[PDB]
Symmetry: C3
Subunit: 114 residues, 3 copies
């Protein structure tokens, strides 16, 4: 699993430990060892959501499997929950795009996961 957050929240408002917290929580939610989890946070972005530049986020979660209707609802609860608590972003100003990747379409260590 790879989780990216792009947000207009400033860097100083990303708290210490947020990357580890994301990593642990995604491990828990996906059932995957945290060694396999990548996270990426991009603050200070020039963004609007609904025409407004109050705090918002555009995110992606790519995963080889573990993507589907109920799982995605459960990830969205968790992740919006973290972004609200840690970054003070209202859940209704967050979009998270979920991508179920084929193993053959993920490269790693000079090969792919196929």
């Amino acid at each position: 699993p790879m989780f990216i957050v792009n947000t207009n929240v400033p860097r100083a408002s990303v708290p210490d430990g947020f990357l580890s917290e994301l990593t642990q929580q995604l491990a828990q939610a996906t059932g995957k060892p945290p060694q396999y989890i990548a996270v990426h946070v991009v603050p200070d972005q020039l963004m609007a959501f609904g025409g407004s530049s109050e705090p918002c986020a555009l995110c992606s979660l790519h995963s080889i499997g573990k993507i589907g209707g109920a799982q995605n609802r459960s990830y969205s609860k968790l992740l919006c929950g973290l972004l609200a608590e840690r970054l003070r972003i209202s859940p209704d100003r967050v979009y998270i795009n979920y991508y179920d990747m084929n193993a053959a379409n993920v490269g790693w260590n000079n090969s792919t996961f196929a």
Copy 2:
């Protein structure tokens, strides 16, 4: 709809109302209320197009539906047009990837759009 532009144009060359203009224009082009529209502009990027670092842009438009052959041609006219007029990027140095997202694969407000 979510529209992201990554460009090597500098921040100072992005004009003041550009995020609202993109939002209104996308609202008009997709038939969707502007409350549902997200936009993100990433200037000062290290990029090349055709091996050259003259102004260029890599973009994406994600939408739940409203994606297809004719619609995409129409969005490309509109968006290249805006990027040419506002950011002074030649349309032939712009790529825009279109993604038709399933509602179940877009998270928002602690749940998905399914």
Copy 3:
């Protein structure tokens, strides 16, 4: 083809000519003229891989065709090889997501490639 790299490696560690090297090597690997190849490098990111902030990268390659099992393995060998040699990122701390884009879903020069 479009190739994007996000990495926590600092901008000063990206060597001169890296964008042009990426362009040429992708041209060679894909069989596509370098005129149509876009590359984008994003350093200084706030990222973790396996919970660690040692050097890593998250990447993507979008291409209209030229995506598949053996080709992706071959692209991964090349790209991880470059990132190791030029940016000193261990191949086992790189993910590259491959996307086979439909021509109708790629915009360019006020139209699409359909």
